[PDB]
RNA sequence: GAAUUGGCUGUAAAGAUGCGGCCUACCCGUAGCAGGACGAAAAGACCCCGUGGAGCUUUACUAUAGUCUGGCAUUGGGAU
RNA sequence: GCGACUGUUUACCAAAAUCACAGCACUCUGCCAACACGAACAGUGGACGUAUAGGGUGUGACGCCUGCCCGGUGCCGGAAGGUCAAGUGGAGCGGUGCAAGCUGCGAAAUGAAGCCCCGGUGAACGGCUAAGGUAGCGAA
RNA sequence: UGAAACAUGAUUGCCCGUACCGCAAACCGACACAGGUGUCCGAGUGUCAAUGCACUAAGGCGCGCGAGAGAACCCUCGUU
RNA sequence: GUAGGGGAGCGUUCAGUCCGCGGAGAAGCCAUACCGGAAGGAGUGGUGGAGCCGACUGAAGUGCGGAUGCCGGCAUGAGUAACGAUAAAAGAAGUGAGAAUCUUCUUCGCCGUAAGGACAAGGGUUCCUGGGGAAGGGUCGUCCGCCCAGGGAAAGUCGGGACCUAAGGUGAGGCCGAACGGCGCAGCCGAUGGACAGCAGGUCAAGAUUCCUGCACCGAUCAUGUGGAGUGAUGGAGGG
RNA sequence: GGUCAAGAUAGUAAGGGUCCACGGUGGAUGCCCUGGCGCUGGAGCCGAUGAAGGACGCGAUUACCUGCGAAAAGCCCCGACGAGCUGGAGAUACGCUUUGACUCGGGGAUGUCCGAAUGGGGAAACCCACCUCGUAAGAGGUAUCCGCAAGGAUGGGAACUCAGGGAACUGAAACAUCUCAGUACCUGAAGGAGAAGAAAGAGAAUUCGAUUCCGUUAGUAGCGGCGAGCGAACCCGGAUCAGCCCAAUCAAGCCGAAGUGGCUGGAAAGCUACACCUCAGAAGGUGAGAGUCCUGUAGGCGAACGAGAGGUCGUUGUUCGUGAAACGAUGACUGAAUCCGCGCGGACCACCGCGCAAGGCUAAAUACUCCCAGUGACCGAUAGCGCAUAGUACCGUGAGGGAAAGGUGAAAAGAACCCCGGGAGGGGAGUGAAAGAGAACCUGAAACCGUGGACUUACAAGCAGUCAUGGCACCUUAUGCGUGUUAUGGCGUGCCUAUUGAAGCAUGAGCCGGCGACUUAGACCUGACGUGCGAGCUUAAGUUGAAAAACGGAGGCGGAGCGAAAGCGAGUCCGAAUAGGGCGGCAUUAGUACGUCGGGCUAGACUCGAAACCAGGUGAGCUAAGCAUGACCAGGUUGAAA
């Protein structure tokens, strides 16, 4: 069953980042994001919503109705964003961090 | 062997001529003179328990 | 490469299996047997053409001649007659005249007496 | 094989429900009988064939375990 | 009638007149026996026995019995002579070289068992030309 | 010199099996199969005797389709 | 016009190349009265939901009704024969969505050298409790030897082992063998046999010479006393 | 109207038939891939510091698998890496993560029990001992074979290598030789390769000069019941190329150019309009089709520290099957020399010639393929491996045999709540582009079951149709021809196989779907067609390049025939010269290489099927017997010897 290899279990991105999503249906929404699931593909940010049925059963007084809940997208959104549009990533170097490196587009943060 | 046995299979048509005399008689149900529901010519009424009066346990 | 027989095959069942139709049971809806009765098929198709023609001038010598014995001829006197008359000639409608026309048949009929005796 | 699966005579590769001629017969079932369907079952176990097979014979051919036998080693010393 | 008897047998069409049997007979076997299993001068069984024992074959309680034919085959014994293997034995023939020599072929006689040959043996094959059916029984 | 043996105290006691079916829907028979399975116990009354035969304790069970009907024919019986 | 020879072509996949086509919708499927001399081709509509026609050339696991062909699916026989020993069953009452078929009671009938009881082997949890209700149970099932979960099995002395040996197995060192290997004394393994310490009761839902209760026995190790001296083998004999 | 009579005729369908519509069943078909096949290349041993392959275990919850192993889904360390992680599992809870987890590389430490298994027993994973070190817990040793001693050996490897032993079917249309074969199988040893190897050689040139492999020579020499059939070597081309010694760069990984708008859509990477990158337009993914969104790619970087003697008898091998038959080899008897020495050059001798045996080790080119990567006019689920994974289920006492099985959607958003039902199931609602995708979820053929409708059917003899006509219905390629259905008439002996002859009471077959049979190869022979050269025409092995093909003449075919052969030659064999046979010239006349094809030959040879034969092993847990050790036979009767 293959699976979110095809790409290579890398996230483009942080599960804290902004980002827009490009292409599908919310298209430029943006959002902060969540979950960061890189073997999957899959990225939870506050974009997208889903009101969705909790089955619970003899869960202690069930009362479940319909929760509003945010499902999870692949690479149909494009991380970090600066121009406002989405934007790839290749200017890096180092910080006072030099124990690290950076990412940035026709501009320079991130 | 299974010494006799058919020559050969029989139409889906032969096989239906057949079975031209399987049909269920529908009941032919009376309503019952007390509680009205419907009941079988010479039975209690399931239904009331009545056959007259009440013989059966409601 | 291997290559499947796919499609291939329904298709040419198709085409024998949906020439019978009022084919009785088996006949036309089992491959094999619609088929294989399709050449006892060929044997009447083909053969009843060099056929209904012996068939039809069947049917018109018996309805010229209850036309020519309606007067007191016979086809094969009849016949002969409009035959010794080379000015007539027809055969071929001599019936239909005698079935619908008794006014035309009668002449034909007559002509050939008056070519006969 | 599929069936819209009669009787008598005849014909047919020589014992026909589907050929011929005549006759009989409204449609569908149930319980029963076993003459027919050269009914089922087993690519006949008889018979012939196959330069097929196999078991068994024997003074068929051939070889061989085994076995007797002469020479040669292990094998020597003393006499006629 | 058959078989003496108890017994045994064709698991899945034969229970029997089949087989076995006690009894009889022939013969083999001297003991690491004859005989048999085994690649094997290993091992082992016969037998931790030893010829009134063990092997093989046939016959089948008991009873009265059991004849005639050894030409043929076999088995035992005899055994002059005939034939017969390897080998021993080297003449005779031929090769090459100049030659010494080196090399092909090949007897006579001699040489084991066996085969031919002589006799024998039937509860050996077997027959009733090697003889021709003693008893007993007999369309069983 | 403080032995072996007895006694009176004490401490000590390992591993595996021990449920249930087990002449049977729990094992071998493809099926909760009319078969096959070794051993032990196996009551009473009556009948020479007995682990026979009849009835029956204890105990176990009526066998995992059922109801009517009362023909032909088939099976297993009774009388003639 | 049969065996056979010769000719021209249809179609299927894969490959190279050309023209392309497609989510307002490909292939495949389905319907059809069109087209071509045939094999066959097209148009239109429906379905479908993603890949795909046509043309030239190249390569083929390339074309099917037969083979008592192979795999799979579904029919006929037909609601037929059967429901697996002719030891029978009846009522009441209860549970339940639903019971001839489960539970309770009261009767009946069958076995009783058994169709009772205890083991062995073999099987494993099938045992007990509470649930379950697809499939299995030749029919129902609310029930089960079936499904799910939890629980249950207790030994110094009963069997076995830490003891013994039989057939047989194995076997240092030995005898043989083309290899692998074949035999073989002692020794060892090896029960179905030898040897060896307990009985009576109680009682979980489910265990019992195993747990408890009562009383007992065996070996071992130590202490105390007695004793007052030998103790006595992988060997002999007796015996088993 | 009526009544009476005589005529005629329709209507109802219990059930059936044909056609249509709609469904169920079922799984073909198409598309797809999480899975296979082949070839190329790479790589190529593991193990008493205990393998291979297993038993029992470890998790909060764990049955299967996975990884491990009581330090148990993991423990240290070095590096790499930067948000996540908390195995497959789709779940909850607990948690762990820059004093950088996790994951990937690379070394350590732990590693119960069995297994060569080796403390002893043992019917594998169990049962029992002993000695030593010792806190007891716990540690360790305790096997056989070589060696003072270190240290080596026992085991396991798909195929490949050598060796010891070595079939038969089958062919020869039977069969004993011979063939099939020294193949299959058994066994021993070994490695990554082996084997072989440095000359008492081959050859006829007084040449070559270890071994091995490919080409060729050649199907020539020759072997052969001279039958079937078997079949060399030298030379020459090429891979590769050494002889030496005794005794007297690949793995982790990091960096890495270039786009927007509008349109269609449920969603665009599609359309359209402008723009950019390009030593990276290989490829996969993203709600449909991607140079510029992601991962990558060309290209660059890139680590602590990790890899790279003679003979005689009996026989036999080489083409060598007894033949005139050498030489090699060896079981048995024998038994030499040594330079004015020894072996051989196919009996044998001389002469001529090549070489020096009885000691040894040796790269490299060669083989195979368990494992790995890449590729494919390979498959794509009855195909492909048996397995989209299972040697599992299932069958067998055992050796052994051995399955089938794929697909919701872009994403769970997997259906809250309400209706009928105990449930199963279903209807709404809601999600979704779509439920004309709902979880017994892509397409969904056919047989087969069913509901509804249309036209029909209850004096009829029927291979089931076909031709003709009428009736009824309908008319999207279709109202003017038809489509469907039907009544009556004529005519009419299923299909295949095998046959002199089949409806045949002769074979085969229940129905449908899918699978299912004249092929492949050899520098082989022979011919048709076509192409290139052409009196000449071609390469094979290999070589070097390859998102390509040139190089490579060793060799082969034309070019002279005739004859047993010497050999002669457009002539030549018969024969002593005159006749002829075969050949040239004949009036004329070429081929050869590659391809497609017809056919031939040798291979399993169109497909399927044998009874049987041979090899190695599995079975006395049934049954026939033996051996050791145990068990069992109510009750009654009779009445022997003594
Ligand atoms: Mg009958
Ligand atoms: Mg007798
Ligand atoms: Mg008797
Ligand atoms: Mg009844
Ligand atoms: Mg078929
Ligand atoms: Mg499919
Ligand atoms: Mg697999
Ligand atoms: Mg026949």
Redesign the pocket.
Known sequence: ??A??????????????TVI????????QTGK???????????VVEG?N???????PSMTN?????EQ?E?????????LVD?E????????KQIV?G???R?A??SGKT | ???????????????????????LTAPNLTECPQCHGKKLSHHICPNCGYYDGRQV?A | ?????????????????????????????????????????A???????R??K???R??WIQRINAGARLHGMNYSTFINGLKRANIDLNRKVLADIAAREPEAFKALVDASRNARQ
């Open positions: 069953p293959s979110g290899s095809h790409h290579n279990d890398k996230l483009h991105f942080k599960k804290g980042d999503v490009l292409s599908g249906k919310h298209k430029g994001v969540l979950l960061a699931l890189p073997r999957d593909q899959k990225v997208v889903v009101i969705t049925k909790n089955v619970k069930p009362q479940g109705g319909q809940r499902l999870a997208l692949h690479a149909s959104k494009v991380a121009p549009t989405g934007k790839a990533t290749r200017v890096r961090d124990k690290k490196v990412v587009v026709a | 062997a299974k010494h006799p046995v058919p020559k050969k299979k029989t139409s889906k048509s032969k096989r239906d001529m057949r079975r031209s005399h399987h049909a346990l | 490469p291997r290559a499947k027989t796919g499609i291939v095959r329904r298709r040419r069942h198709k085409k024998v299996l949906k020439r019978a139709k009022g084919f009785w049971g088996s006949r036309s809806k089992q491959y094999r047997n619609a088929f294989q009765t399709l050449l006892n098929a044997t009447y198709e083909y053969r009843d053409r056929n209904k012996r068939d039809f069947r049917l």
